[PDB]
Amino acid sequence: MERASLNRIGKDVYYMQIKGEGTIEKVDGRNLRNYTLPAYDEDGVKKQITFRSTKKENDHKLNKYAFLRLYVDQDDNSKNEISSIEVKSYEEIQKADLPEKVKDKFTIKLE
Numbered sequence: 694m695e696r697a698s699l700n701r702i703g704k705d706v707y708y709m710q711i712k713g714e715g716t717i718e719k720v721d722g723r724n725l726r727n728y729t730l731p732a733y734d735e736d737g738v739k740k741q742i743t744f745r746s747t748k749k750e751n752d753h754k755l756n757k758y759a760f761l762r763l764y765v766d767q768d769d770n771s772k773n774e775i776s777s778i779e780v781k782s783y784e785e786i787q788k789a790d791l792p793e794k795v796k797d798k799f800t801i802k803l804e
Contacts, residue, residue, distance in 0.1 A: 707732045707740060708795050709761035709783075732763060737794030744783060760786045760799070 709732040717724045732740040742763060746752075762784035766777035788796050 703735045705765045705767065707734050707742065707763040707765065707780075708786075708791055708799075709733075709742060709744075709763060710799055711755050711757050711759055711761065713757065714755070730761075732761075733795045733798045735792055735795070737792075737798040739798070742780060744780060754785055756785075760788060760791060762786045762790060 709730045712730055714728070716726070716728055718727055719725070727743055727745045729741065729743040732742045734740060744763075763780050764782045764784075765779065766781050768776050768778040770776040788799070791799065
């Protein structure tokens with residue numbers, strides 16, 4: 694009826710999975726190329742995030758089954774008033790990089 698598994702500290706890190714690619718959204722009469730995929734934070738709570746290929750991102754990667762790791766920064770980091778309150782970077786990873794809660798949130802205990 695009780696466990697000493699008390700932990701109240703988390704991190705500003707999210708995890709996403711690749712579902713598709715060719716997605717267009719026409720804004721101002723102009724066709725934009727963006728990606729909208731489901732994500733989970735370190736606690737495993739469901740999220741939905743939209744990213745895009747920057748001038749820093751090479752192609753070929755992003756495997757339709759592989760996972761992603763999204764880094765978000767805190768609005769006031771330390772000395773600078775302006776910071777990356779939105780997703781500053783992302784990383785392509787495997788199920789092993791995922792925390793125990795998140796991995797189960799993706800596979801739904803299927804494996």
